[PDB]
Symmetry: C2
Subunit: 231 residues, 2 copies
């Protein structure tokens, strides 16, 4: 019943792992600077995700024991945007630009699905019982681990070659997200099972659409390789 759900996520993860974008990010025959062309795209997601954790997932005024554990989970994930901004700078992507060019970049029509992923999760999850909220978090954290397992490859390559401490496209981020059960010990209704199926499918479809935009961005911006600096 719930075994079915944890199992649908593993099936979804194994499909997600095979997307062309990940084959590209893992390709060691391509400079890591070329593979991380997609890095600024994450700007449309990373601060929205911080806010999802802080304001949508987290509920400080709850006694329910499942919301209590969600709150602890959300507090750790709400710190990773700063790591994003750390590696933005190291990769040479923290460029000077007009305020309006920064805005037109984030709200690019080419980053629609990247930008609205967190919005879609909030609308999905706003009227969910805490145990259905945990499924959302679990599916989203599974998609996240796949993406960062991949990006930490070019990332750790640049970190060692330049001798700099990367925090976002880094083993240390993967390790914390590995660190990220009670869902084993939980029983779902037929209703709660059908809902959880709908959730897992939507999260993996929305993450697939975001990865699709990263792949299109690399192909559109082939010249704009990372420009990291050595020590």
């Amino acid at each position: 019943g719930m075994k079915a759900i944890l199992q649908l996520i593993l099936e979804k993860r194994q499909e997600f792992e095979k997307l062309p974008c990940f084959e590209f990010v893992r390709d060691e025959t391509i400079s890591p600077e070329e593979r991380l062309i997609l890095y600024p795209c994450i700007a449309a997601f990373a601060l929205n995700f911080r806010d999802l954790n802080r304001y949508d997932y987290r509920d400080d005024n709850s006694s329910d024991y499942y919301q209590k554990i969600i709150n602890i989970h959300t507090q750790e994930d709400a710190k990773h945007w700063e790591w994003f901004l750390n590696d933005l700078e190291l990769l040479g992507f923290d460029k000077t630009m007009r305020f309006s060019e920064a805005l037109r970049f984030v709200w690019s029509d080419d980053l629609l699905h990247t930008r609205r992923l967190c919005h879609n999760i909030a609308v999905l999850s706003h009227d969910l019982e805490p145990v259905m909220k945990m499924v959302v978090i679990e599916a989203m954290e599974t998609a996240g681990l796949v993406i960062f397992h991949a990006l930490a490859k070019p990332g750790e390559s640049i970190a060692k070659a330049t001798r700099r401490k990367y925090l976002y496209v880094a083993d240390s981020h993967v390790e914390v997200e590995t660190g990220h059960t009670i869902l084993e010990q939980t029983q779902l209704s037929s209703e709660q099972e059908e809902k959880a199926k709908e959730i897992v499918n939507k999260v993996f479809q929305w993450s697939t659409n975001l990865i699709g935009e990263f792949e299109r961005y690399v192909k559109a911006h082939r010249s704009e390789k990372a420009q990291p600096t050595a020590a």
Copy 2:
């Protein structure tokens, strides 16, 4: 019924019009450059609002009378973000910064209610039938009109003085929003939901104006720098 709902919107607008922010923005004893220091704050709202119209409010495959009305409405409101970026440039607020400084500005804790107003409206409206979305939209458009009625006062003073065409903090924008800001029978359940909708929209709009007020106080020297 629907009658009292429009009366509530009217009462909330009369309340909203008299916030300190708007007394400040309307104060012709202060330079219009100072009355527009809130302007860059709208960056957290204007592009979100574009996306609310394009992606949340709009549903092209609908025969529902009210949704067809909403579709036409949303198509106009979804163009106003370019006007925002036009006047950002004219006001001297389109400055060169690090990408990260732009992100930290928009995702400022000081602009939380500004940034999430559209998110709150999306969450509130996502399950509503089109007649009830119309209530959400009328409330929001009414609050919009109050704000732009105020901002166009220093806006047009700067446009005339500099001989440049302002599009956002300008009478031409107010003219569109005047058009935007019917008689239906609502279940008692709907009348109740509609009253909750009007109360929430004017509360979240009041919170946003609150942040503009705080920003102006904290950045009181950062006046607009238009050129003639």
